Design a protein around this ligand. Structure first.
Ligand SMILES: O=C(N[C@H]1CCCC[C@H]1C(=O)O)c1cnn2c(O)cc(-c3ccccc3)nc12
Ligand SMILES: O=C(N[C@H]1CCCC[C@H]1C(=O)O)c1cnn2c(O)cc(-c3ccccc3)nc12
Ligand SMILES: [Zn+2]
Ligand SMILES: [Zn+2]
Lengths: 348, 353
């Protein structure tokens, strides 16, 4: 039932105050860390990146769990693609404050994360009612997790910033020309790109700032959602997709079959649905039920075909069997089909 | 009559190549001048502002270019001059210390320094000369003479603070380009150009005037309600062509009546301002369908005429500043331009022959 989707959206709206006060607590701690980090010669150019579901207004997860990125301005770097993977790179320099992090010619993610982690842990000791845990088994990103007031969790990810042209692997990505326009695609591609440490001393491409821009400025019409005539359901469809997946992951947290899926998979599928449906009239709020059904159906088709390209790097298949086994896709496919056939009881 | 408008537009297009190679000649000289300028401690933050009719793709009449040099400076505090809404004294909340006169930044001293270093560096660049631009209140400050090509150069201080209060009700693009876009543009810097606020000696010699030329460029080059306006055949509009035709109509009338003083105070900025107001009044892309170029241009002309008859043409960014005030343009000049435009319109624009 379409009205059951609206009921979910209504209740997700109720967490807005708690997300906002928690975010205010996070900002105060993060601002103090950045000021202390800036005092170190290697991290002088550190800053907040201001990305993630909170800033996209699509935060449906726990109000006590945030993800923040610290960006670091770097000398003009030279990238070397690792093993034709299109998304992972070694970082070298064309010409250095990060010299202490070099391992031969390449920038060591291990050495940089070590100092990043040590400074944060030292500085958290002088912040009232805050502790820090090293995030393990994520290849280095996120690097640390803060615990604020014994209530709020903050995953912190380090990201190198490069103002160079985007790597060649992105040349055919971000296929927004028929939706957001060729002019916008060109303007976005003039923005920096980021590299997060992600296991070899490899770094992985990140475009979280571009995803935020697209989600918050999402219509073909510049006035999309700014008046009653132009209210669309794009952002509500994404919230519902994220909530469906999170609810199913929670329901089967015991079993192992859904642990490899993440919000990024549904977010990526959603961007492809936007490419496939570029007109605002295809997203009329009065058709929220059908729009969500088509979003679910698209995600199911990705699962069944085992194809879900990174929206920026089309040759990187998030649904490769190297990343997610076939049985996990089959399990999630069956669970979602069951839910959809029964008007989503996991939403009850 | 619409086909005659298209004939004008096609002929204006023939000058694209010559504008481009001349613009390339200018870019080389300006780039070298800026590199030399940035060696001076006061102008370390100098840069090219990518504004003007060329960058807007609407350069119609004339080998003559206008360019702006932006200057990053420390945090500025503004003092409005005589309720003029557009003219300010500049104070600082310092590289420009030698150009203060008391608490305020002297436009006179800044121009003298700007003109000196330009004249110094041009002495090395061969096949380029510079003369002082006079009787424009300080903006433009100089004119470069390259090889056939003239380049007016304006100095523009950059302020990254919130825009002045006088702009609070301007830039009324919310129903056309969106409230989100208006917010994003108002987060961009604004500029101040040295500009005498009134004739005569005194405090009026040290004022600076608000400039939003970069915002005008952004809106003109990204002008549709639809992000894909003019990017495909279904969404071709005639906004930019209407502006070109309005500017060409004024330029041709100013040339035809160069023996009078009536049209001397009108400039392309008046029709550009009127055009932005017409875009506010007609916010939907379907109102600008290329099939209706003739009617769209007629409606642009009509709007300009109404501004003339009512003696009201607010600055698009500063709504309390009336470009058509009697203090700036006398009634008889507005009436003369009104009559000549009406004659042209009634006769299928003989100035476009
Ligand atoms: O959760 C995320 N990803 C997981 C699911 C996809 C495979 C990696 C997983 C992981 O690294 O944990 C994820 C959250 N943001 N983000 C992002 O901005 C980029 C990428 C990405 C992925 C592949 C290639 C290049 C970039 N992933 C993410
Ligand atoms: O030609 C231009 N202006 C003439 C016609 C209007 C009155 C002043 C005239 C002059 O200064 O010569 C003009 C070209 N750009 N530009 C601009 O970017 C801003 C302004 C402006 C005007 C009034 C108040 C605040 C700003 N004018 C211009
Ligand atoms: Zn919308
Ligand atoms: Zn257009």
């Amino acid at each position: 039932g379409a009205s059951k989707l609206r009921a979910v959206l209504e209740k997700l709206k109720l967490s807005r105050d708690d997300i906002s006060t928690a975010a205010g607590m996070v900002k105060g701690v993060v601002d103090h860390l950045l000021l202390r980090l800036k005092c170190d010669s290697a991290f002088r150019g550190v800053g907040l990146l201001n990305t993630g579901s909170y800033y996209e207004h699509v935060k449906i997860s726990a109000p006590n769990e945030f993800d923040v990125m610290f960006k670091l301005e770097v000398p003009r770097i030279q990238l070397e693609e690792y093993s034709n993977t299109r998304a992972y790179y070694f970082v070298k320099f064309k010409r250095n404050p990060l010299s202490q992090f070099l391992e031969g010619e390449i920038l060591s993610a291990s050495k940089m994360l070590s100092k990043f982690r040590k400074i944060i842990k030292e500085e958290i000791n002088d912040i009232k009612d805050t502790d820090v845990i090293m995030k393990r088994k994520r290849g280095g990103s996120p690097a640390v997790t803060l615990l604020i007031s014994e209530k709020i969790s903050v995953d912190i990810t380090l990201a190198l910033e490069s103002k160079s042209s985007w790597p060649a692997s992105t040349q055919e990505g971000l296929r927004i020309q028929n939706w957001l326009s060729a002019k916008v695609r060109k303007q976005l591609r003039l923005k920096p790109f980021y590299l997060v440490p992600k296991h070899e001393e490899t770094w992985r491409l990140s475009f979280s700032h571009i995803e935020k821009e697209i989600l918050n400025n999402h219509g073909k019409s510049k006035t999309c959602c700014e008046n009653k005539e132009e209210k669309c359901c794009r952002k509500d469809c994404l919230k519902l997709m994220k909530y469906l997946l999170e609810q199913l992951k929670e329901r089967f947290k015991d079993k192992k079959h859904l642990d490899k899926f993440s919000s990024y998979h549904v977010k990526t599928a959603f961007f492809h649905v936007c490419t496939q449906n570029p007109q605002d009239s295809q997203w009329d709020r009065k058709d929220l039920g059908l729009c969500f059904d088509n979003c679910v159906t698209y995600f199911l088709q990705c699962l069944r075909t085992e194809k879900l390209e990174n929206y920026f790097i089309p040759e990187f298949n998030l649904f490769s069997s190297n990343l997610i086994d076939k049985r996990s896709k089959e399990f999630l496919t069956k669970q979602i089909e069951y839910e959809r056939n029964n008007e989503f009881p996991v939403f009850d």
